[model samples]
Target: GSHMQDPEQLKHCNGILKELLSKKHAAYAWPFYKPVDASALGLHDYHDIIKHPMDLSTVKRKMENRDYRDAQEFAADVRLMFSNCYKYNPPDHDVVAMARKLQDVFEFRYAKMPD
Candidate 1:
């Protein structure tokens, strides 16, 4: 069973971050956008997997989109990133291939990738 103590809300944060970083949207990625401050995402605790709107909104506003916070632009970047990652295969593959690539990791020992 998944851990209920801290739900895997990584998707919530990553989803927003990807949109901002992908740089494919201008409407959705903008500054002055009303962002959540860690209280809006139901994570009033501490954990990497757990996210609050604070983290994501800050990233979108202060970091990426400085012109205006538009959801439309944000949405486009998200689609592009996902599409890229999905199509990140040898060509002529499917989601299964993407899934397999995602799952390919050396877990013999725990170590962070080179920074």
Candidate 2:
């Protein structure tokens, strides 16, 4: 049998992901909605700077594909997205601030998820 998560937990993770994607503030949510195009954005060193890049859409796709075995595994990728942001952006950068806000939201909701 595959190690994929049960449908119930998968639904819970999807709900959290939906809320994260639904955040409407351009300053806080826009940069994280999709994968960064390092070459297109002229971030030549982005891949070098942040070894593990992540984004909400990638997380959503991973969840749907059963790549994660549980909600915590899903949570790890979410955290990694912000961690990558923190690593690549300056502390005062707008995207860094946005990452903080969204990370807090994720933690708050993730805390209430079933164990």
Candidate 3:
């Protein structure tokens, strides 16, 4: 049978990564992802968005309907909601860091959340 991993290796794990981080450019170890073409986004999202040029105009229309003073009020509400959802509900965003959340929205990012 193959030898089991040494338990002592855990103690030196950070030192090894820290040394790697120091010896190489920080970004080198961050994450490496191959560039994906727009079509690589897969299925219908890319096509649906491209087909709906009107959606952009609709947002502009909604903004125009808002009085300048009231515009900031609604924007603040949305910003607050997004911030809360980003922190609490987790995001369904396509960003690589949210990979797990994309797969399972209910999963916690950390082993424990701060009280």
Which regions of candidate 1 deviate over 4 angstroms?
A: 1-15, 18-63, 67-69, 90-115
Residue range 1-115, candidate 2, lDDT tens digits: 4344456676788898988888454457789999999999999999889888899999989987889877768889999999999888899998888888888888888887764
lDDT of candidate 1 over 35-110, digit per residue (tens): 4233564645423432222323443554244432343333343343334433433454453353333223211111
User: Using lDDT as the measure, what is the rank order of every candidate, best first?
Assistant: 2, 1, 3
* RMSD per model, one decimal: 16.5, 2.4, 19.3
- Which residue pairs collide in model 3, if any? none
Candidate number achieving the greatest TM-score relative to the actual structure: 2
For residue 90, model 3's alpha carbon misses the true position, in angstroms, by: 2.9
For residue 75, model 2's alpha carbon misses the true position, in angstroms, by 0.6
Better of 2 and 3 by TM-score: 2
**What lDDT tens digits, residue by residue, belong to model 3 across residues 10-109?**
2233233233234343343222122223466453443443332211123233445542233233234323322333443226543434333221321221
- How high is each candidate's TM-score? 0.25, 0.88, 0.21
Candidate 2 residues lying further than 4 Å off, grouped into runs, are 1-6, 23-27
Which residue pairs of candidate 2 clash? none
Model 3: number of clashes?
Answer: 0
| C-alpha lDDT of residue 11 in model 1 | 34
